[PDB]
Design a protein around this nucleic acid. Sequence first.
DNA 1: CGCTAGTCGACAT
DNA 2: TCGACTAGCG
Length: 343
Amino acid sequence: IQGLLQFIKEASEPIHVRKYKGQVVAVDTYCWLHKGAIACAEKLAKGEPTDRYVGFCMKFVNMLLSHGIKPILVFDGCTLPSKKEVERSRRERRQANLLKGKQLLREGKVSEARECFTRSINITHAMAHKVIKAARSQGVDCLVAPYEADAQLAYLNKAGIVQAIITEDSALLAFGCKKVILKMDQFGNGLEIDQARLGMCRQLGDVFTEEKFRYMCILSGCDYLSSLRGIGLAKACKVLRLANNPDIVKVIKKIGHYLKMNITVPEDYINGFIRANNTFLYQLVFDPIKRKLIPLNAYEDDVDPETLSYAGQYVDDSIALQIALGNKDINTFEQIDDYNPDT
DNA sequence: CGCTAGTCGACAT
DNA sequence: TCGACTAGCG
Ligand SMILES: [Mg+2]
Ligand SMILES: [Mg+2]
Ligand SMILES: [Mg+2]
Ligand code: NA
């Protein structure tokens, strides 16, 4: 969600991680991976061996461990079919910046070339696994999500397994997270947002419940569904405030009326909205206790799970376990490690 | 004002 | 993995 943090900044508190001393905090590790990969973009683009991002993550991990924090590193897994568009686009951008960067290396211009290399960064599962080994070497629990780390984190937080989530993506709130810590530096200073405190935001109105908030985020334009032309956070929120009807479908079919604008709503956009909603609600996560694949939320009676392939497809529990442990590479689907949490 | 969408940014010498 | 910033539209 573009500009979500600025939109709900009144619900944020400048905190320090000491607040969660002795408690358990889950981490959106790919953020630290993207931050760490920039320091060595040149060598990553050229294919030269590098492991600085590992130590970069380990600074943060050790920082948490020093304050008595019990961290759980969560990593992005398989690509979600309901997100293939964004992945494809970002991939194209990466390739383009890579090519232009190489050409700029041929020109001798190193500044611009580096400026492209830093934008052509691609976080693989191999790097992530380097981080995993490095972390497990110091007794830090690591877990690969079946798909997006967002949903997995949301589950870990809702299940009571973790009490807070360290990330740079505020849109995690739309998944149903209770507490989210943003912009955390290497010392432990960050910005916390509580779900219950969403009432602090005046411009939200009565749109602070999970359902309405989720609707707002989707309508604003997310990674699952592009917003209608001229529709952002404020206007979607306005729609949800002015809307009295619970059935969101008719509301969206009356969005032109609610905003006093001439909006044409394609029939496919409704299906896309249902898809995005069901994706936010029932995206497959991995229960670490029972060791099995479950949706983020228990299925309702108004949904047929067979049509929810875009929210991720089920696999055997053993395979899901081996992926979650990081022993199985996402793309090759072959064993790359043989870790066992039992012995 | 508020949406777009491009730009620029994240590291670290 | 993503947000901050802004010129420009309505
Ligand atoms: Mg990826
Ligand atoms: Mg994510
Ligand atoms: Mg996200
Ligand atoms: Na939008």
